[PDB]
Amino acid sequence: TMMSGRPGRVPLQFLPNEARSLPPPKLTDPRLVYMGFLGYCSGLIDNAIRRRPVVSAGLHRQLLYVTSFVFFGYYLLKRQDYMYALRDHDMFAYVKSHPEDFPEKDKKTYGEILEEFHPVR
Amino acid sequence: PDSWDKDVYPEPPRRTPAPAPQTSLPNPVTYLTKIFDLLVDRPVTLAREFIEQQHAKNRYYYYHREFRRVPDITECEEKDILCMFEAEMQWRRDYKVDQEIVNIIQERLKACQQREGESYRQNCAKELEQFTQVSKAFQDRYSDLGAHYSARKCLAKQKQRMLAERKAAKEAAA
Numbered sequence: 001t002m003m004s005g006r007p008g009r010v011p012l013q014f015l016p017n018e019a020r021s022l023p024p025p026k027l028t029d030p031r032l033v034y035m036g037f038l039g040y041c042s043g044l045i046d047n048a049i050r051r052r053p054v055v056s057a058g059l060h061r062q063l064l065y066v067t068s069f070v071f072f073g074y075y076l077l078k079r080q081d082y083m084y085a086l087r088d089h090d091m092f093a094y095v096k097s098h099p100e101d102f103p104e105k106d107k108k109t110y111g112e113i114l115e116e117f118h119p120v121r
Numbered sequence: 122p123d124s125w126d127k128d129v130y131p132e133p134p135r136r137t138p139a140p141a142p143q144t145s146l147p148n149p150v151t152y153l154t155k156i157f158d159l160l161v162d163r164p165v166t167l168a169r170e171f172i173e174q175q176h177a178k179n180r181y182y183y184y185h186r187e188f189r190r191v192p193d194i195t196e197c198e199e200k201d202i203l204c205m206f207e208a209e210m211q212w213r214r215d216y217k218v219d220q221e222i223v224n225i226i227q228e229r230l231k232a233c234q235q236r237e238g239e240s241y242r243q244n245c246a247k248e249l250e251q252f253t254q255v256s257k258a259f260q261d262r263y264s265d266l267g268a269h270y271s272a273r274k275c276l277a278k279q280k281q282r283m284l285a286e287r288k289a290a291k292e293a294a295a
């Protein structure tokens with residue numbers, strides 16, 4: 001468990017207060033569109049299993065499938081983005097705090113670096 | 122013809138001997154050349170005059186792209202991806218230009234062989250040495266880089282050559 005038990009973590013909180021400072025996903029996010037596509041596929045499979053006309057029947061039901069998937073996908077994307085932002089924040093802070101462990105190395109050009117040449121023949 | 126550069130693609134002056142006939146018999150080659158000029162050369166020249174007249178009314182120009190020099194892989198720092206990319210592209214363009222230079226020298230060699238004919242072994246000695254020098258330099262540069270050649274690999278090859286030459290010079294001066 002890497003980030004479980006990180007200080008200041010409220011248990012059973014899907015989205016903390018500090019996540020509000022991040023850009024929310026655009027409603028036309030390709031990931032949101034894919035969640036809607038999953039909802040549509042679920043609706044078609046429902047019609048097929050129940051032996052209704054696949055594309056025509058149950059338009060209200062198919063709409064509910066798509067809407068539920070888009071809703072949950074929006075909140076899932078927010079939580080995923082928050083966790084990744086948290087990971088990057090922690091990593092940058094640790095690198096800043098441990099300079100002796102993450103030292104800046106002098107850059108040498110390829111005119112100074114010597115590399116063995118392996119001919120292909 | 123002003124189509125190409127006579128310095129890049131040289132040809133010796135053409136010495137054509139004057140005819141010196143010694144027979145009363147007519148020359149079938151001359152008669153057939155006259156027939157060819159009457160039946161073929163005149164119609165094709167008229168057609169080209171018409172086409173060239175049509176071209177001159179719609180004159181337009183195209184230009185030769187100019188590339189400025191950028192820092193090379195020797196100056197690029199290690200794992201500096203942008204400078205490495207620019208240097209690699211520049212090296213690739215220079216590789217293409219060198220290939221075409223070798224092609225030009227080979228064209229010179231072939232044309233001289235055919236032109237000289239039965240005395241090519243002596244009359245094409247200048248072109249043979251030039252081809253030898255150009256091909257040797259091209260081979261030493263890009264000889265065994267492989268299918269996945271790169272400016273870094275060529276730099277490593279040149280560094281190896283420089284080390285070998287320095288060692289040989291030290292041993293000679295010893």
Ligand SMILES: CCCCCCCCCCCCCCCCC[C@@H](O)O[C@H](CO[C@H](O)CCCCCCCCCCCCCCC)COP(=O)(O)OCC[N+](C)(C)C
Pocket residue numbers: 004010011012013014068069071072076
């Ligand atoms: C009507 C609209 C549609 C609703 C449909 C609902 C269906 C899903 C139901 C909701 C499930 C999540 C519940 C949300 C409220 C609970 C809040 C809490 O549970 O969230 C966090 C925890 O929530 C879950 O752990 C994460 C929820 C996300 C799971 C769904 C995505 C799974 C990834 C699958 C990726 C590929 C599929 C993509 C989705 C299609 C709390 O963290 P914590 O209390 O400290 O956990 C302790 C244990 N640990 C540390 C070891 C983890």
